[PDB]
Design a protein around this ligand. Structure first.
Ligand SMILES: OC[C@H]1O[C@@H](O[C@@H]2[C@@H](O)[C@H](O)[C@@H](CO)O[C@H]2O)[C@H](O)[C@@H](O)[C@@H]1O
Ligand SMILES: OC[C@H]1O[C@@H](O[C@@H]2[C@@H](O)[C@H](O)[C@@H](CO)O[C@H]2O)[C@H](O)[C@@H](O)[C@@H]1O
Ligand code: MG
Ligand code: MG
Lengths: 724, 724
């Protein structure tokens, strides 16, 4: 409906109606829900919620199905005085019912279109079950694999994260200005603003601290890119930002998000974060929490009651302007209008059962394709892989038969629809003998059974991994290792004298040195989702050819953290030339290098790259155009990820040794050759200075073209002169 | 001499003379040295140094003895045109020839007077060998025991560090305005400005980053306290501070150090740090390095040549003001005048051999006393300790006979004068049987020998530890554990069925859970210095009673780092109540608590404390006066460390759960009772806000009185009203 009519609604609402519009609740706190009704009475009483609250609530969080939504919405519109529909929001993180790989695995794809497709299918399915908003993408930069939430990020590089962030928004939303018409697309909500990934010691919800310049340089760019691409909502973070909980941080949310980033949508709190500023010790009570959160421009309080119980008295007593409340309500109403809820509150569902769109075979093919783009081949000694379909396989370990392959942050997908490793392999391989072991134990009996199976077969597929519950939210590990029983299992299998491929399933970087040394091949599958076993079988048999690259560094050991490719040089860098000396930046007990670096991954193919002549000089403001010819010089079709990095050799701030500024994943048949071109705009050459200005300085840059952050040719470009 | 005459010298100097005044060199780069003279020609050529450079150099770094000094200074004053004497500077970190405990161990003393004495004796001896300046105290706050340089800090608390930092300045300098008369005292140089201890991943020289507010709140206060107490010099740090290498950080060194902290002495570079800004990528070349370092106010370049080879051209071309040079030269001359060098350039030595004053028995008694104050008794199950002098002792392990007990940063002390553990024990105990093992191995032959010795005796003294070379500068360990052979040794010794005391010698916090669990008692000796074996024997026999408390947290495991007592609460704290739930700040695999906390330490005595009635309310600006009565309720004389912490419950910045604000180490005879009083001024109640103002806010504080950061009684005080 027209804007005038939206403003009209705001004027017509009572104060109590406006306050409750800023509250989000679980579905079973509403009448008309069709699940968990036994939770409703107790919990309404505990939150001290009344009908006047729930009949005017603004939003539902985590509806369980289309029927739940329809029922809740129908009952609510019966009794709502002005006919304002609820908006329904959900966590669709890496798929709805068709589960795609976890985001960190999608990071390893280096493939924008893979990520857009995941987001499209997610929305197709989620809208079919009546969800309007997804709490994705998660764009927290991560340098610390202790933190369980790395699984939800695309990794340690802001440029990659920004690019795949944009891809996800485009896939969920399509043309954002048509979300009232395109009812198979949904609103995206960027999270968690800001810098949540820098949690001290990888500990969940823990202190975050960095300079404002670093915040702007590394931690903000990905949220900013997704906002500029049209993300409709933003969610606050649990952590402090320079000492102030993000949720009531007026500088962060008013000056930066609403001011500088020009964000004019709904700012929704993370779960309970408005009430938690009390625990943080920056509000005395819920009256203060409410006041400060509203000052900071939080429109929507998720599942706490600070707003509903305190706003009235704050507005009555004059501590808080009613104008701040009206602008929140107006943003909530504009969101609903943007989704077409005032013309169709059932968002396409009321006379249209869209069950048919959920968990289709076409969608499964897409998740499989996503799986095979995202996996990373870390070792393959002696061309052990791909296996022949006649290879006789002993398939052993805790991930042999585990149905736990869908990943963390899988709120709607079901393990029964998932394909485990055994099932996947037996579709492809005629002889498989299986010995499943426990996640945290290695018994004598297991060793006997494993030994017997390996004696029978020709090659071992050792399937190791984490339970998904060892990561995700509030799954912090001080030591980033598998249970020791799995390292013992790999050591045992090695002694049997048969070639061993390790297929590793996990949600974070781990200490894998002992796995690489105990096997001939090592494949990082992460958690591929619904098609897990087929993803694995096709990569092992060569039906698909591994093409993923690490989007996060794999530490030598836990105490190397944080280690990441885009690091500063320091004043005493270790060089090939000073190897050995005491007074240089090094550890006495490990290498400075991570075990595996950013952008690293193997292939069954072999490629050669050639960069065309680059200029020696460039004007300020000028783009550098980078042409690369790549040839598949093997007999196997495959894909390579061309990566381009820039370094600022001398600057007024000590700049990273490399930063990724472009990438493209190129598919090549045997013998095929292609040319791709990149444009590094003058923004790629810029950075934040000690004064927090985005600047471009004259001087020397190096340009790295290659297939990892380490496997590169280097070129020099002197920037100066006049500005374009 | 008169200030006017000092100025006169500056006017009389040529440009080349002024430039060279800002250079510091090793002694064997001068004519007249009496050691390492064969290094002189090659190195002079490599640095491309001439006589005109060395005959006008401003300072000598690391003279080897009084004779080296006298010789160098005598030859130099022969040829120097205006008669400006050299100033001689050295690393006297925890003693000269009489070696005291490493600073981190001195932290654990919680004893201001112990620290002042160490500093007094250090200066007595160092001045006797002709040094004018010491590069101490090191006041870098440390939260990361991977970093080898934690040994040189007093630990994780800014208040403790500030207080002992002041004690060290007073001990070295005495009345700073009389350093021309008191020739047994010497100038102190505060280091490393600033925040060097926050090196990322505990990696030497590595990136430092934190908000400016945190910089002020936690990282600056100890340098500031030592500057205000009258420290004559400051040394720059190796690291970046918000992206700019400290050495050329104009904001840091001009605005903060010279402006806000009102420091008007010599700013000396850390070793090579002026040249190393090039490596950091914030200067293109040595011409830029010089220009920027001088702009930032660095007066004295340590052992690099940027200044001498580039200042002339910078001044000639007008890229740098000659006035900046003259003020550096004037600060250098004022330092020399403060030390009386213009009346006596040999600073008391020329007709007075003070060999007499070095390594006296009185001094040894003081280092022993320091040792016994600083050790920390971590476990003592079943009153194993103290041992009777008739106890028959198996003394085993790598520290049984090792002479490596003087600590890191022992530039002048000699192992032959040290007392090892065996020697110390046999002065006290009639029966000791010794089995020495290696630091990194545990052989079958060792086990047989250990077994035989333990069977013969009644109690095991298991002496475990680090070589000093595993810490100090550029001794970063990614995993903070002893060599695994020592853990295996402790496990083996435990199976022998005899009571075990572990005496642990080390320069950092270590993972000691496996030691505490494998023994009945555990004594943390750190590196006590020259009197090590006697420090150990006296504590073991009860001749002295352990009284140290930890000045740094001991992590459950490496991946808990950083862990520290003064932490933020977060938005989802673990409580007694919610412990068990998923969605709280916790690790899946370890406790949140460190293994041992700040301020923790045992005693052979037992004490009780009672805090007198506190007010319920306080005005802004008002001091809180805290009276504590402590009684020794045992039959053993000993010392307790009374600690007082404050918390700011609610603030505009999320404030730590506790901060130490006072402490006193109280000595009590059996049955004795004392009353001590503390004043927590309104500055103890203050903090830096989001705008970097030092503020006091009205509201609730809690006051904790006790004997650790955990063992405390808690009291509430409501601050508000008017201001004093
Ligand atoms: O689910 C919406 C957003 O909120 C958080 O998940 C909450 C968690 O913080 C809370 O403790 C539990 C209690 O039931 O529910 C979860 O829903 C996540 O941190 C957000 O990413 C999520 O989008
Ligand atoms: O000793 C003067 C100051 O120098 C640094 O020590 C240097 C070290 O950086 C350099 O690598 C070696 C070269 O041999 O000399 C050492 O003396 C220390 O970090 C400062 O704390 C010290 O006060
Ligand atoms: Mg540059
Ligand atoms: Mg307060």
């Amino acid at each position: 409906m027209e804007q005038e009519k939206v403003q009209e609604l705001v004027s017509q609402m009572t104060l109590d109606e406006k306050i409750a519009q800023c509250l989000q609740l679980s579905p079973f706190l509403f009448k008309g829900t069709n699940k968990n009704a036994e939770l409703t009475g107790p919990l309404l009483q505990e939150m001290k919620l009344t009908d006047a609250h729930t009949e005017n609530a603004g939003s539902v969080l985590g509806s369980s199905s289309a029927l739940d939504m329809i029922g809740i919405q129908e009952a609510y519109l019966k009794t709502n005085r002005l006919g304002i529909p609820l908006v329904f929001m959900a966590d669709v993180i890496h798929g709805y019912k068709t589960v795609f790989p976890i985001p960190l695995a999608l990071g390893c794809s280096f493939d924008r279109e893979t990520v857009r497709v995941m987001a499209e299918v997610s929305a197709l399915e989620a809208t079919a079950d009546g969800h309007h908003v997804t709490f994705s993408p998660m764009l927290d930069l991560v340098r610390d694999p202790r933190w369980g939430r790395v699984m939800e990020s695309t990794g340690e590089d802001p440029f990659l994260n920004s690019e795949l962030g944009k891809a996800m928004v485009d896939g969920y939303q399509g043309d954002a200005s048509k979300l009232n018409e395109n009812l198979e697309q949904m609103a995206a909500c960027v999270k968690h603003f800001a810098a949540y990934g820098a949690a001290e010691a990888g500990l969940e919800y823990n202190t975050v601290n960095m300079s404002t310049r670093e915040l702007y340089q590394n931690y903000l760019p990905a949220y900013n890119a997704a906002i500029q691409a049209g993300a409709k909502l933003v969610m606050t973070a649990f952590n402090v930002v320079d000492g102030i909980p993000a949720t009531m941080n007026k500088w962060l949310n008013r000056d930066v998000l609403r001011g500088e980033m020009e964000f004019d949508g709904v700012l929704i709190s993370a779960w309970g974060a408005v009430a938690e500023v009390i625990n943080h010790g920056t509000a005395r009570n819920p009256k203060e929490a409410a006041q400060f959160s509203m000052e900071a421009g939080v429109d929507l309080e998720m599942m706490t009651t600070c707003y509903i119980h305190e706003l009235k008295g704050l507005i009555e007593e004059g501590k808080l302007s009613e104008n701040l409340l009206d602008e929140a309500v107006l943003r909530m109403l504009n969101l609903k209008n943007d989704l077409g809820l005032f013309e169709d509150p059932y968002r396409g569902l009321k006379n249209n059962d869209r069950t048919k769109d959920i968990l289709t075979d076409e969608s499964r093919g897409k998740a499989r394709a996503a799986g095979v783009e995202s996996a990373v081949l870390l070792e393959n000694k002696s061309r052990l892989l791909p296996l022949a379909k006649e290879a006789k396989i002993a398939l052993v370990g805790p991930l042999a038969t585990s149905p736990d392959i869908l990943g963390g942050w899988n709120v709607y997908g079901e393990e029964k629809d998932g394909i485990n490793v055994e099932t996947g392999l037996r579709e492809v391989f005629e002889t498989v003998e299986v010995v499943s072991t426990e996640y945290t134990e290695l018994s004598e009996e297991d060793k006997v059974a494993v030994k017997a199976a390996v004696q029978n077969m020709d090659v071992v597929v050792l399937a190791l991994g984490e339970k998904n519950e060892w990561g995700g939210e509030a799954g912090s590990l001080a030591t980033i290792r598998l249970p020791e029983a799995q390292y013992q299992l790999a050591k045992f299998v090695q002694t049997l004298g048969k070639p061993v491929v390790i297929t590793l399933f996990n949600g974070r970087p781990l200490e894998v040195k002992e796995l690489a040394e105990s096997s001939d091949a090592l494949l990082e599958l992460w958690f591929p989702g619904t098609e897990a076993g087929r993803v694995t079988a096709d990569l092992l048999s060569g039906a698909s050819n591994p093409s993923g690259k690490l989007s996060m560094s794999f530490p030598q050991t836990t105490g190397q953290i944080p280690v990441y490719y885009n690091h500063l040089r320091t004043g005493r860098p270790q060089t090939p030339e000073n190897k050995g000396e005491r007074y240089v930046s090094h550890y006495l007990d490990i290498p400075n290098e991570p075990f595996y670096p950013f952008g690293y991954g193997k292939s069954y193919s072999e490629f050669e790259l050639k960069t065309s002549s680059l200029p020696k000089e460039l004007n300020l403001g000028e783009s550098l155009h980078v042409e690369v010819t790549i040839k598949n010089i093997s007999d196997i079709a495959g894909k390579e990820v061309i990566q381009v990095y820039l370094q600022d050799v001398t600057a007024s701030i000590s700049r990273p040794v490399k930063e990724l500024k472009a990438f493209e994943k190129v598919a090549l048949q045997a013998g095929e050759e292609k040319t791709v071109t990149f444009e590094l705009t003058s923004e790629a050459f810029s950075f934040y200075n000690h004064q927090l200005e985005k600047v471009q300085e004259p001087g020397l840059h190096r340009v790295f073209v290659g297939t990892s952050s380490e496997d590169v040719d280097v070129f020099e470009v002197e920037v100066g002169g006049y500005v374009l």
